[PDB]
Amino acid sequence: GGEVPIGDPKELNGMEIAAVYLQPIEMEPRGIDLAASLADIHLEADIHALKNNPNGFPEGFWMPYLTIAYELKNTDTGAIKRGTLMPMVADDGPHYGANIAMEKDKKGGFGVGNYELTFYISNPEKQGFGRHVDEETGVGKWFEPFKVDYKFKYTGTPK
Amino acid sequence: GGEVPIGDPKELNGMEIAAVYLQPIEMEPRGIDLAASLADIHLEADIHALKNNPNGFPEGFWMPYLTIAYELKNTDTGAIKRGTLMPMVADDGPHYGANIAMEKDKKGGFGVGNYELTFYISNPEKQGFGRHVDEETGVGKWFEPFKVDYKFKYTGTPK
């Protein structure tokens, strides 16, 4: 393995939205995220433009400036935690991600088991990103905030 | 209208950096930039990854989360103005831009003539953008702040 897919990707609002996890990843700038040593997985959202995206993004481009909150629930134990993914880059391109404590989680209940993952996604305007709205070069309005849901079995840190 | 290219594009720091100007463009959300009614041009920086970008960006992808300031100098009159370009999207894709008063600027001296344009560019870390630095998927350091220079003749608002 190396990279473990979470559920099936969704296509909505002119974007493909997939979720994957890796082993914990050391990040810079130092302190921008939970330390790899204190985590068990690195959760990623992969979000790219589809064909005929309605907001001016060419097919395949990364969708930047999104706000992505997450909710991770172990449905066996009831354990719930929430956070936000941050924009970042790996050698294979930009994405949104976060290091997450699972077995290391202090309240516990985030071990091996069945999970529900929710991403809550809001458009780039929230982060100061503009749209041309003239007749010749303008683009359509952005989507309203929305959620996408996945189910997956967590088997431990990929190795 | 139509786009007027400014000088020659430059290749540095994993990126191609080009400049163009168009007619003023109304921007949304309203108030995010100078009103089209008060400008003479809309200045764009078009910045995309080169091959083998050292920070992991695929060739041709837009370079996001950059901090970009401009300085425009009329070399005939000596007038200098400065400002920031903001991230935004048009029908052809994401870019950095700003509506700019030229003939309309009440200070005067920003009329038709010979100009030098400088972009001052700082890396995404300054805006909270992260990088993987693990052995498997990690990428190298970002560039230090830099400038790029162009010379062009401003012929008036594009027609």
Ligand SMILES: [Cu+2]
């Ligand atoms: Cu990541």
Ligand SMILES: [Cu+2]
């Ligand atoms: Cu623009």
